Amino acid sequence: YFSLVGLLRLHSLLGDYYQAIKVLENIELNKKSMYSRVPECQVTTYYYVGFAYLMMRRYQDAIRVFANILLYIQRTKSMFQRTTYKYEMINKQNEQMHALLAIALTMYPMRIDESIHLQLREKYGDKMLRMQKGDPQVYEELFSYSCPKFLSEPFLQQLKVFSDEVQQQAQLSTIRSFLKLYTTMPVAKLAGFLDLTEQEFRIQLLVFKHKMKNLVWTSGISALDGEFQSXXXXXXXXXXXXXXXXXXXXXXXX
Amino acid sequence: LYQFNPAFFQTTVTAQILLKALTNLPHTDFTLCKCMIDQAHQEERPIRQILYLGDLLETCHFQAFWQALDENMDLLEGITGFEDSVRKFICHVVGITYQHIDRWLLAEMLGDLSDSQLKVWMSKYGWSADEQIFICXXXXXXXXXXXXXXXXX
Amino acid sequence: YDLTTRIAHFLDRHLVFPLLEFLSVKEIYNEKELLQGKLDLLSDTNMVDFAMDVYKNLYSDDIPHALREKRTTVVAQLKQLQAETEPIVKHGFRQEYLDTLYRYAKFQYECGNYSGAAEYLYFFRVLVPATDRNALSSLWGKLASEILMQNWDAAMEDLTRLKETIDNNSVSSPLQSLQQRTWLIHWSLKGRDNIIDLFLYQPQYLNAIQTMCPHILRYLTTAVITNKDVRKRRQVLKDLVKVIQQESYTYKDPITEFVECLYVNFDFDGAQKKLRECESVLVNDFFLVACLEDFIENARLFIFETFCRIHQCISINMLADKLNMTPEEAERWIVNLIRNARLDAKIDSKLGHVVMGNXXXXXXXXXXXXXXXXXXXXXXXXXX
């Protein structure tokens, strides 16, 4: 299995994406043999899974594999703490993997966590701030300055392709975050907000394009007026009540 | 085979593969092909230009696509039905993103069609002009009781 | 307002004459007060260039005796100082050389040649016995001369050299002086949000030298009030209304005090009428003149925002009629404000109706609830 993982990694470095993915699909094998033989091997497997997820459109699978290799913030926002058993060089590799995961991790949920990560570095914290700001100009500059980190082989990453793709997804999220919730919206307010986006004409186009994505819903768009319009509830309430009970249970059990 | 045996890289065949992949949108074909071409080759003419055109389609900038599309482009001549295939994708997107749409606008998005040609596509997806082209307890209670009990406890 | 008191109020010579010349140039060429007092004041001093200007039309009649005496006494003084400095460079004593650099600075300043006053002023750098007195006073001087030459960059520079300098005394105002200079530099350079922070910070209780006591009250007050983007509720409340020290400056110019009380209290019409009243005087202010139109407009925008966020639907025509300012003018102002994106006002002038908006709705509340639930879960995990 280790040979398969190493070979797959080599192919990925010099190899096509689909064959490597197929190898990864064969590749997974019982946890226990790996656990008995060494601490590190499991971490390496987790890293490989994370890489596959990154290649894969979904960041969910990689998010799980990376956290298991290294501690990650859990749903319900509880700290996940990893074992220190693996050899220190291996642990450093794991930390590097965790740093890589942040990229997958940010996509998975939220929000501004770097507590496990060192406070002093602005490389990751700065990136987090820029995402929070919602303005590309800072984001673009962050890529520009830390151009060196992305490059680290050069042929293998000639064009920075992945980072650019990720940034373009990242830019879209904030607009959806207003997320409609208004039956009818003034055009001017939309224009002011869409103006911030680099293309001036995007709102006529950028707004319609968003509707196509379906992240956000626009009503009355393309209208002569020009102003956008924008049991289930019970289920939602019940869900919340369930969460509350769960929290109480954990408290009582504790 | 081209990625693994660089000396065999064929520009025309690669361009046709990419263009045909685009005719298969909304499927992932176009993206998969891109995964199979390294940066150096994607940056070469006319692969760079073709990827740019694909980008316009993926981002659904249809007017920009038709404008940027060198209608008399050599590679397109042999690709039978290329233009109509692109239109099918556009109508797929339109059927998902519009409730109502201006007749003039749809024709523009489909490549500046005559009213007669537009009629062909409206007919194909069953769209018709309107004012315009017409396009388109007990358990709960028990649950609360349990939740309440849990809270009380 | 009377000029006698204004001119009298400001200690600084540049304010004493430059302000008179500004009032004269700034508003009406014809009016006597700007020119008569400036003439008479200039004739009390060593600058014949300013004196020459006074001699020119719109100025007091030229006198041969005044210019010849000044000019000659200057030649003599320049020879004297030149020699003295020659000799001081040649007793090998730092203090004497420093005095000479300072004295050349004084001589050039009074003579009205500012570049040289600056050069010879900062030439005292090397010969400073101590940074705090020799060096900080050099700073105060470069600050005076830089303000008067209109480079506020340099003012900030020597402000950071001075306040960066290692030895600082809490008791001394010079803190006050430097605050005033910085405030002034920020004000000369949306809202700065720095100028007000500075001006509001402290009062020496000793003469400003740089800033009129009224000047600090008004500059602080208006800059603050216009800082919608920067200002906290506290910034309106914490750093101005609740700020007891600044109250001292404020009681000096009560029209501004009531202007701020009006704004904080939601009567924006009253506030804006005060502003309209003072506008003509504030256009006479040598430092404020250039920012007046901007600050008032910003205040108006803030008032509109306060009105605009609190009401979902607005009767625009009624507001214009009930505004206490003309409805058409108000509409024009709103139109100007909107494009900037300052206001998310949804307005048609013709309709006279205005509408601003801040299952979907129901989902919103539900989403928030879920968010809180998530946080709670996180806390539980941390505890475990």
Per-residue three-class SS string for C205-226: CCCCCCCCHHHHHHHHHHHHHC
DSSP C239: I
HSE of C226, CA atoms in CB hemisphere, 13 A: 24
Nearest-by-Cβ selection for A78 from C345, C355, C382:
C382
Beta bridge partners of C354: C314, C347
Cα–chain center distance at C36: 27
Query: Could you tell me which of C323, C331, C306 has the C-alpha nearest to residue C231?
Result: C306
Nearest-by-Cβ selection for A247 from C355, C356, C376:
C376
- Contact criterion met (CB below 8 Å) for C336 and C373: no
Whole-angstrom distance, CA of residue B106 vs CA of residue A222? 12
Whole-angstrom distance, CA of residue C7 vs CA of residue C35? 12
CB contact under 8 A, A254 and C383: yes
Contacts of C133 (CB under 8 A, 6+ apart): none
Whole-angstrom distance, CA of residue B89 vs CA of residue A112? 39
Query: What tokens were used for B151?
Result: 């809270």
Whole-angstrom distance, CA of residue A252 vs CA of residue C360? 36
Q: Tokens 């202007």 identify what position?
A: C259
Q: What are phi and psi of C201, to 5 degrees?
A: -65, -45
Chain A CB contacts of C366 below 8 Å: 233, 236-237, 240
Chain C CB contacts of A77 below 8 Å: 374-375, 377-379, 381-382
Contact residues, chain C to chain A, C-beta under 8 Å: 338, 341, 344-346, 355-357, 359-364, 366, 369-370, 373-384
Please state whether the peptide bond connecting residue A111 to the residue before it is cis, i.e. omega within 30 degrees of 0: yes
Whole-angstrom distance, CA of residue A217 vs CA of residue A75? 27
The kind and range of the H/E element at A184 are strand A184-185
After which residues, if any, is chain C broken (C to N > 2.5 Å)?
Answer: 90, 189, 358
Chain A CB contacts of C344 below 8 Å: 186, 188-189, 192
Whole-angstrom distance, CA of residue C6 vs CA of residue C26? 15
Query: Taking CA atoms, what residue in C is nearest to A109?
Result: C374
Nearest-by-Cβ selection for C377 from A76, A181, A189:
A76
Chain C CB contacts of A254 below 8 Å: 383-384
Beta bridge partners of A4: none
SS (H, E, C) C27-53: CCCCCHHHHHHHHHHHCCCCCHHHHHH
Query: What tokens were used for A37?
Result: 């033989």
CA dihedral in degrees (C301, C305, C311, C317; nearest 10)? 10
Whole-angstrom distance, CA of residue B137 vs CA of residue C60? 97
Chains near B, with 3+ CB pairs < 8 A?
A
Query: Could you tell me which of C199, C122, C109, C195 has the C-alpha nearest to residue C154?
Result: C122
Whole-angstrom distance, CA of residue B93 vs CA of residue B101? 12
Report yes or no: A189 at the C interface, CB cutoff 8 Å. Answer: yes
Report yes or no: A245 at the B interface, CB cutoff 8 Å. Answer: yes
Q: Tokens 């990720």 identify what position?
A: A166
Query: Could you tell me which of C100, C106, C105 has the C-alpha nearest to residue C87?
Result: C100
The DSSP-derived string for C312-371 is SEEEHHHHHHHSSS-HHHHHHHHHHHHHTTS----EETTTTEEE----HHHHHHHHHHHH
Beta bridge partners of A184: A229
CB contact under 8 A, A189 and C346: yes
- Contact criterion met (CB below 8 Å) for C311 and C304: no
Q: How far apart, in Å, are the Cα atoms of C314 and each of A182, A187, C308?
A: 18, 18, 8
Query: What tokens were used for C375?
Result: 């946080």
Query: Could you tell me which of C136, C133, C140, C73 has the C-alpha nearest to residue C107?
Result: C73
Angle of helix A161-178 relative to helix A202-213, nearest 10 degrees, comes to: 90
Amino acid (1-letter code) at residue C377: X
Query: What tokens were used for C371?
Result: 């968010």
- Contact criterion met (CB below 8 Å) for B109 and B68: no
What is the bridge-based pairing of β-strands C313-315 and C353-355? antiparallel
Query: Could you tell me which of A62, A67, A63, A69 has the C-alpha nearest to residue A31?
Result: A69
Q: Tokens 């070979």 identify what position?
A: A7
Deposited resolution, Å: 9.3
CA dihedral in degrees (B114, B119, B124, B126; nearest 10)? 140
Query: Could you tell me which of A11, A82, A96 has the C-alpha nearest to residue A42?
Result: A82
DSSP B133: B
Angle of helix C327-339 relative to helix C292-310, nearest 10 degrees, comes to: 90
Q: How far apart, in Å, are the Cα atoms of A208 and each of A183, B27, B89?
A: 17, 21, 17
Helix, coil or strand: residue C103:
helix
Whole-angstrom distance, CA of residue A118 vs CA of residue A105? 17
Please state whether the peptide bond connecting residue B46 to the residue before it is cis, i.e. omega within 30 degrees of 0: yes
Whole-angstrom distance, CA of residue C167 vs CA of residue C304? 47
Q: In what order do the strands lie in the sheet with C313-315?
A: C313-315, C353-355, C347-348
Q: What are phi and psi of C273, to 5 degrees?
A: -70, -40
Nearest-Å Rg of the Cα atoms of chain A is 22
Whole-angstrom distance, CA of residue C269 vs CA of residue C302? 12
Helix, coil or strand: residue A228:
strand
Whole-angstrom distance, CA of residue A211 vs CA of residue B92? 14
- Contact criterion met (CB below 8 Å) for A244 and A232: no
Nearest-by-Cβ selection for A251 from C344, C363, C380:
C380
Query: Could you tell me which of A212, A134, A219, A227 has the C-alpha nearest to residue C360?
Result: A219
Contacts of C179 (CB under 8 A, 6+ apart): C198, C199, C201, C202
The DSSP-derived string for chain A is -HHHHHHHHHHHHHS-HHHHHHHHHHH---HHHHHHH-HHHHHHHHHHHHHHHHHSS-SHHHHHHHHHHS--PPTTS--------S-HHHHHHHHHHHHHHHHHHHHSS-----SSS-SS-HHHHHHHHHHHHT-HHHHHHHHHHTHHHHH--TTTTSS-HHHHHHHHHHHHHHHHHH----SEE-HHHHHHHHHSSS-TTHHHHHHHHHHHHTSS--BSTT-SS--EE--HHHHHHHHHHHHHHHHHHHHHH-
DSSP B45: T
Chain C CB contacts of A233 below 8 Å: 362, 366
Query: What tokens were used for B149?
Result: 């009990």
Whole-angstrom distance, CA of residue A136 vs CA of residue C213? 45
Please state whether the peptide bond connecting residue B26 to the residue before it is cis, i.e. omega within 30 degrees of 0: yes
CB contact under 8 A, A212 and B105: no
CB contact under 8 A, A241 and B147: yes
Positive or negative: CA dihedral A103, A105, A106, A111: negative
- Contact criterion met (CB below 8 Å) for C42 and C51: yes
Beta bridge partners of C348: C353
Give the ranges where C2-151 is alpha helix by DSSP (H): 3-9, 13-16, 18-26, 32-42, 48-55, 64-89, 94-110, 114-122, 136-149
HSE of A37, CA atoms in CB hemisphere, 13 A: 11
CA of C345 to nearest chain A CA: how many angstroms apart? 8
Cα–chain center distance at B113: 18
Chain B CB contacts of A214 below 8 Å: 96
Cα–chain center distance at A102: 7
Rounded to a whole number of angstroms, the distance between the first and last alpha carbons of chain B is 67
Query: Could you tell me which of A71, A75, A105, A60 has the C-alpha nearest to residue A246?
Result: A75
